[PDB]
């Protein structure tokens, strides 16, 4: 049912649909090493992707409803030169008629132009002053639907944000070729990332778009804060979703020392451009593969690994005493050889029992395969210590709201631009 | 109070670059300064006001200030580590790419 | 003729030994021992004074290089002259008379040196004090030896070397207790100033006058009277010795049984007397190099020179290398500031151990700042203003000054190395020396402490030697202690920190003292009473000359390598031990 | 016996000799306000003085001996640009033949050139590294004599400096016009002052030269350090000639306070250029007219004046208590209404009884016209206080060498360039 589906292949980009759209790329188009299927577009002229469809699938009707889906990653806007700088990322307008998606400061805009110059705009606005954002430098699943009789709707991660009637619009023409390029950007260091572009010749409903989001979310693969693939042997800062104003810290080395949530986080500010919180605070949590037989560095679901903690640029190991008081027992970082038989195995969990994707969680287990439980935090004498217990699993069995069993991995990224 | 204002010193057009500092200042106004890649570690500022100044790639650490303000000041790529320079001490100022880390505890107002 | 003289000398020596055995050991010997110990403590004190007062005397007297070294080395030249002079004179004028004269010269010139303000005058006064004190050890030993019987001579003589270390600890203690009080600025005359080191000099001169006061109450050596044909008073001195000993014992009723003593038969005016004195003094000196004593004298020369060279070289080497290690550690901790622009800023600050390279200062004013070991290099000062600036070890190398003013500063022209001044003014310059002088604070204290340790290191070995001097023998103890001294010299490689060198200095000082005691005893017993003091004084002058040579050589080698000092010291000590092993044995004999 | 004598007149320069040489003066040639007879020449092209003689007095012989004389004042040389920059100040050559006066760094040069281009040079060299100089920025009486048979000699202030034989020189031609301008100086801020230029058709001996020096010295007028006229109501720093390394200072105000000689003076240094001593150190002496009926400000010989003393920018008065112990009694500066009947009248002396010119001196006298004596300095317990005693007068009567009764008046000058 898809007309265009740009999917990576052996050092090229092909179309999954049975239409054979011509695809040509520039010499300055970059690709991620681990996740090649995502494409980086930089502010230049040669950084261009042209895709030519067939004349039998060119949008030239008036009652024809259509939709499309993609994943987009927009870095943070750093200076005032990005204000009021509406620039186009994807253009399908010829002779002043077509559909076009474009980006402004904290804005993603879908524009429809008919043969009668009429403009209809659907706008998704995300703030840049928030402490922790779900959109700034993070992958966003953006789709639009366009029903020529009722409305045009924007979906971000499968949820309604905005809708605008398009009944007044007449006949809308479309270009034979589709453009992937930053057009009209005055910022010379501005780039975006895009992947999984799909086009459909009808208005999609909530159920189909949610199914698409789940299918392309790669629920069986771990994800970090930015939405990329989780990897071994890479330092990650820690974030607790239910306590996002504190970071993991250590006090003493060994069992006698405890890892706790220290606060508050700092801020990064540029005087009416952004007032975000610092994500590069705390101690780094490296992941070391233990029993995963996969050759690649990507971390998958149900993997059994070990966790190292970087303290004064020295790698220690996660461990806890299995036999002590209570189930809410204290975790610690100790020297790598001196663990002995202390519990170190952690199972990575991304998707639940029913298969619904959720944020990454770590399950501490012993050598005997007995579940210590999900790693969380609990308050001892006003101090939030890292505790692994089966209480979170008890709430999961009871379908209750767990408190403290979700984590986010923040690696250093160039789209955030915070000094370390 | 009025006598205190009378004894206030004024320092115009002051350039400092690539210098490390600890000092205690009291009852001064520094106007039109220009500081580049300076490290300000452990300084006490009482009734000291910086006006029309420019700090670029500077570094503040362990800064404590009472009745200190940065009015008409511009900060570029500067880092405030372990300081109590809260947001009410920057009056009509412009911070660019500036980071506040490990802020000291204090009341929201003066 | 020679046979008759030898027989007469042998008979005199045997009868003198019999008389001494009859008199016995007792209170008189210990009283004379304490008096001569005061005399030797004066010598022990004299060798530390200039070394302790140099850090203050350089600032108080504007001392440059080649003036600190000569001031440090002048005491040994003084003793080299004085030992020979008084040793030659004592065999013709008496032991006690020449001891009194030499100690009086030492006291007078040491008193004068404490109030002298110049450098040449201070050099002269200290050289004359060294001349006065040079004749202490030869006369003291050759004078105490003539009151001891052959039964216990090595131990009773070796107990006399305790006072040298006692004087060392006294000097160290008073240096600790006087010098650090830099505040004392007693003013007697506007153009002159008296600091604490002059008080230290006076207090160090005190033991010499104490020694003179003690010596005024003792009788002359009877042997000197007997050799010079003077009979009656030698008999009275022996009678006094016997009477004192027996009264102390508890039997004040027996009578001196000696009635007649064998005596050596004797066979413009001021100029004649001086010419005659030079005559038979030269005669005694040459007869020391006679057919009967020519091998022994050469062995003495070799042993004395080698041990003096090694000991004094290492003794002056250890503190120098401690200072070098401290200096290298100081230079390790130096801060460097490359590139620095400061404009329109007023300043007061204190800077220590810093290097500011390539700065640019325009229209700054530097009011009231202190600079310790601060170097400004490749800097540019334009329309600057300096005021109330004090600087120790501060230099302006490759700097450029334009339209700058130096008001009330001590920035003298030697602090501007390869610098360029343009339209610059110096006004109200502070008073100061034309060159650089270093100030020492708590660093002096450790110095004194180190010195104390060295003297304490001497304490054990002395006792051991003093307990075994007669039991094992002179030659064996001399060679044995020289061997451990050479081994300690070889072990110098295993030390590169201050604590390690303190330990090494203590070990070497504790090891060589037995060798020195044995050498003193052997020198005493190897000569007859008519050239004992002459030979001992000549050998002590040789020791002082070797001390000068070793001090210069070993101070020239500090901070270069640690193989030249080890090689030199070990070679010299091995040569000395080899030459000492081929000497005659004098453990049991009559003093002759 | 004089051929040319450039003297000042009513707003022009004329010739005292009976030859009427034409004079042309540029538009940038200046004059001193008080001593207009001294002419300032700067380093420009319009600052020129032309003197055209008659054809009957132009030097064109070979046996003819001749002399020249003038007063010259050369400021300090401040930087290395002035080094090796021999520049002509007085030019009388034509077709590479004639006599020329020039100046180099610390050098005054007289050059003779014949028709065969043979060059003879006589040089007076003064050092710029001296603490106090008699030549730097001070008026110098230069005389040059040229006898064609034996030698050519230079005289600085009436004393011989150098003599170079000129017997080898042939016929010397001279220009009809004589130059006065700085020719060939690379320094744009370099000027000279010149006065009383005279030319003679014969070689002058020592007697005539000393007579000329004494006549042109104006021995009846007091001169300051730079050689100019001494004026009332002008602040002067004070220098003792016998003790030139100490400056006049005061300690307390009033009779209980004494004026003394504090030292040493500082230095003014430009590396490898000058290492002079500071002249602007101490307390300024202002002179006020009391009985002088002259309308002009110029201080003359035998004038009876008062001496204010500037301490902390406040003017006190010279006075001493006539009745006290000894003859050498201490002088002091006191409040101007406090003086009462203290000895404050002073008589300014320049020339001695015979009329021989000597340095400035001050004779303190009482209201009864009794000579307290010449103001000097004497040491009491290593402090050199100013004492007014008749001992100096006794030595003058005995023709003995007085010690410390001669002073020098140093005002601020632009040719010295020392910062105050
Ligand atoms: C503000 O910073 C961003 C990010 O740069 C980082 O953060 C800075 C505070 C400083 O620590 C930098 O060293 C960091 O790399 C800047 O945007 C980037 O600037 C670099 C230039 O160093 C350039 O190479 C990148 O391409 C830029 N990236 C983007 C997305 O623009 C930004 O320029 C800074 N703003 C100002 C006004 O300086
Ligand atoms: C060195 O100084 C002289 C004299 O100037 C005075 O002294 C200086 C130290 C400074 O304090 C100045 O402000 C003083 O006025 C300079 O020569 C004069 O320079 C001024 C310019 O300021 C100029 O107007 C005069 O004509 C100059 N006079 C002469 C006789 O040339 C000199 O330029 C200074 N040297 C350098 C390298 O700057
Ligand atoms: C100056 O600041 C440093 C760093 O905070 C501190 O170690 C030092 O003690 C301070 N100096 C003074 C005099 O307080
Ligand atoms: C200070 O403020 C004024 C206006 O209030 C502005 O023109 C000026 O640029 C400011 N100073 C600086 C250094 O920007
Ligand atoms: C700094 O210097 C000024 C002027 O010399 C002086 O008054 C002040 O006491 C100094 N401050 C310190 C701390 O030494
Ligand atoms: C330092 O000296 C070198 C030569 O010794 C010179 O080339 C350099 O210019 C000097 N530094 C400066 C800042 O001029
Ligand atoms: C009085 C002892 C003296 C000696 N003649 O042996 N000593 C011992 C060490 C150095 C020295 O001169």
Author numbering:
A (entry chain D), D (entry chain B): 876 to 1295
B (entry chain C): 477 to 586
C (entry chain A): 137 to 403, 418 to 742
Show passages lifted from the paper.
In addition to the monomeric SV2A–HCA2–LEV complex, we also obtained the cryo-EM reconstruction of the dimeric assembly of the SV2A–HCA2–LEV complex to 2.90 Å resolution, in which two SV2A–HCA2–LEV complexes are assembled through the LD4–LD4 interaction, positioning two SV2A TMDs in a near perpendicular configuration. The cryo-EM structure of the dimeric assembly of the SV2A–HCA2–LEV complex is formed through the LD4–LD4 interaction, in which the open edge of the β-strand from each LD4 forms an anti-parallel β-sheet. The TMDs in the dimeric complex are in near perpendicular orientation. The association of LD4 may contribute to accumulating the glycans to form a gel matrix. Further study is necessary to address the structural role of SV2A in SV morphology.
